[PDB]
Amino acid sequence: MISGILASPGIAFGKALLLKEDEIVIDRKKISADQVDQEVERFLSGRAKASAQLETIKTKAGETFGEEKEAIFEGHIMLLEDEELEQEIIALIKDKHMTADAAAHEVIEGQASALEELDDEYLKERAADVRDIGKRLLRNILGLKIIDLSAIQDEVILVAADLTPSETAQLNLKKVLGFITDAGGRTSHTSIMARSLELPAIVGTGSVTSQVKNDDYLILDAVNNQVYVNPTNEVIDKMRAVQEQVASEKAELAKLKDR
């Protein structure tokens, strides 16, 4: 009874992989000139590893999807390295006595909102992607661990409310059998990679992420635009025969000669 937008046709079986993240909380406490020096080291030093980690992902986007996607990530890194934005963030900490996480959010607050004022798909989408650059920085400033999605060792379905271009660029396509998320479906980066790879996919899940837990057994039919949650063995057996019968029918052509 879950009808999504159907991004690609096909049928797949696997466990539901739910991605859970800890919410990021900003501290609104004002520090004294005694701890301001520490903010500069964490901010200045944070950019040191952040630039290195993000820089590695840029190559993955170019070697995984080609230079077509590398150009989008290359521009985002320039913003982080802009000598102008760094000086402003530093001034807010010393001028307004704000923490590095709090001061950084102020700059990002206008960079993201400013891009939303433009009515271009690239500039507008850049607004969401730019917010991601600041969101990751916040997780680094507080020392929050990052989930490494490229370390998956079990073949299962990927389920998430939404994926950011950075997470998709470093995603492992060999261990994921499909993508099912709760994205509106308008220019969704996840759906775009799916169409290029022709793998089955869906995005209009609505609220499945709030109704499924990790390890749930799900069947993606990508045919009638419906997903089954907690299906009985009788249902699985029926789809296993008809679904596999389709794949076996195509193998008969290449088994003999040309028929």
UniProtKB/Swiss-Prot annotation:
PTM annotation, UniProt = Phosphorylated on Tyr-122. Phosphorylation on Tyr-122 is important for polar localization but not for interaction with TmaR and for activity.
Q: Which residues cross the membrane?
A: none
GO BP annotations of the record are: N-acetylglucosamine transport; phosphoenolpyruvate-dependent sugar phosphotransferase system
For this chain, the annotated S-S bridges are none
Broad class of the protein's primary localization: cytoplasm
Q: Locate the Phosphotyrosine modifications and list their residues.
A: Y122
One GO molecular-function annotation for this sequence? Answer: identical protein binding
Q: Which residues carry out catalysis? A: H189
Give UniProt keywords alphabetically. Answer: Cytoplasm, Kinase, Magnesium, Metal-binding, Phosphoprotein, Phosphotransferase system, Sugar transport, Transferase, Transport
Q: Where in the cell is it found?
A: Cytoplasm
Q: What results from changing H189A?
A: Very strong decrease of the affinity and catalytic efficiency for PEP. Inactive
Q: Name one GO cellular component term.
A: cytosol
Lineage: superkingdom: Bacteria
Q: Which family does it belong to?
A: Belongs to the PEP-utilizing enzyme family.
Q: How does it assemble?
A: Homodimer. Interacts with the pole-localizer protein TmaR. Binding to TmaR is reversible as long as TmaR can get phosphorylated, whereas binding to non-phosphorylated TmaR is very strong and shifts the equilibrium toward binding.
> What does this chain do?
General (non sugar-specific) component of the phosphoenolpyruvate-dependent sugar phosphotransferase system (sugar PTS). This major carbohydrate active-transport system catalyzes the phosphorylation of incoming sugar substrates concomitantly with their translocation across the cell membrane. Enzyme I transfers the phosphoryl group from phosphoenolpyruvate (PEP) to the phosphoryl carrier protein (HPr). Can also use (Z)-3-fluoro-PEP (ZFPEP), (Z)-3-methyl-PEP (ZMePEP), (Z)-3-chloro-PEP (ZClPEP) and (E)-3-chloro-PEP (EClPEP) as alternative phosphoryl donors.
Other comments on record: The reaction takes place in three steps, mediated by a phosphocarrier histidine residue located on the surface of the central domain. The two first partial reactions are catalyzed at an active site located on the N-terminal domain, and the third partial reaction is catalyzed at an active site located on the C-terminal domain. For catalytic turnover, the central domain swivels from the concave surface of the N-terminal domain to that of the C-terminal domain. Enzyme I of the sugar PTS has been shown to phosphorylate NPr of the nitrogen-metabolic PTS, though much less efficiently than it does HPr. This process may link carbon and nitrogen assimilation.
Regarding domains, what does the record say? The N-terminal domain contains the HPr binding site, the central domain the pyrophosphate/phosphate carrier histidine, and the C-terminal domain the pyruvate binding site.
- What's the protein called, per UniProt? Phosphoenolpyruvate-protein phosphotransferase
What is the protein's species of origin?
Escherichia coli (strain K12)
Q: Which residues of the full protein are shown?
A: 1 to 258 of 575
